[PDB]
Ligand SMILES: O=C1CCCC2=C1C1(CCCC1)N=C(Nc1nc3ccccc3o1)N2
């Protein structure tokens with residue numbers, strides 16, 4: 566089941582590490598959670614709908630401003646790239662920051678580089694995280710949003726919440742070489758406890774769908790395996806949208822995609838069929854969840870996974886084996902791969918009482934080492950007072 570430390574443990578760990586690294590007590594502290602997507606995969610960059618929820622796994626940042634004008638960072642996460650420490654001067658008009666080594670610091674460097682407010686002072690900071698790094702629960706986005714929320718303490722920002730999510734997204738593109746969508750940054754910033762967020766990535770309007778049923782559990786199963794094909798999938802969708810004269814696959818419904826089948830590639834048609842169908846499935850999933858129809862929600866999860874496995878082809882044999890094992894347990898409503906795919910985690914919605922047997926059944930039928938997280942919908946990025 567694997568324990569989830571709470572803000573008190575992470576804050577204390579981060580603050581003890583700060584004292585034993587910089588001599589003084591930290592002056593500021595922030596946290597930003599990871600996320601799991603209940604449904605709506607690879608609709609992100611297609612101006613579609615997603616239904617993520619923030620997790621109890623989070624990244625905590627403690628620090629203090631400096632008069633030096635340098636940034637000094639240390640992270641305690643064991644999976645972090647080596648070295649665990651890095652120091653650099655703040656960017657100027659002449660010289661700007663550039664991505665490099667270690668890779669974990671590029672997320673921090675990107676947000677600093679693209680931070681819209683000034684003057685930004687130097688700072689010392691310690692980073693702690695309970696999000697498994699690169700495990701498909703968007704550890705990077707939690708670090709980007711935590712960094713942004715920390716910098717707001719150094720110098721308050723003026724833009725909208727959407728502008729903050731796009732800054733962290735701009736950091737991921739340039740400093741991490743990953744052309745991701747907006748969901749991970751958005752849900753980390755905007756999550757609310759006991760609620761999933763139906764996010765329209767075209768209008769950035771959000772809808773809060775409550776998930777605070779004690780008889781309901783969300784189970785995260787990390788496959789522990791491992792994105793070469795993610796870019797390619799993005800441009801196949803843009804070519805299909807361009808071929809149909811539309812700005813994005815959000816503007817295309819299944820009937821028009823079927824009517825224009827001969828205007829696009831055979832693979833391109835199979836990618837758009839998932840994207841257009843998945844957008845519709847999340848709208849149906851949100852509605853099913855509002856009225857408490859967990860069985861209908863679970864069936865939409867299974868359709869989403871099979872669609873990702875056959876039409877979008879972004880699943881792997883380990884994920885498919887984890888989903889089929891979970892689907893055999895009654896009291897599991899549905900199971901599905903989450904994140905970009907090619908490994909990572911599977912999300913499962915199930916009855917709370919069935920969680921112990923589900924984990925034993927999933928583990929027994931998996932040809933690897935599966936790690937489990939039982940998570941509730943958590944709050945978004947928040948300032949912590951020391
Ligand atoms: O090389 C990769 C592979 C693709 C995914 C990705 C990375 C690494 C893991 C190792 C360094 C780079 N890290 C993240 N995210 C992340 N690193 C953190 C460090 C400290 C606190 C919170 C953090 O969240 N994502």
Ligand SMILES: OC[C@H]1O[C@@H](O)[C@H](O)[C@@H](O)[C@H]1O
Pocket residue numbers: 605606607608609610745746747748749904905906
């Ligand atoms: O649905 C796939 C998702 O995969 C994530 O890893 C990515 O950061 C999101 O933007 C979204 O595209």
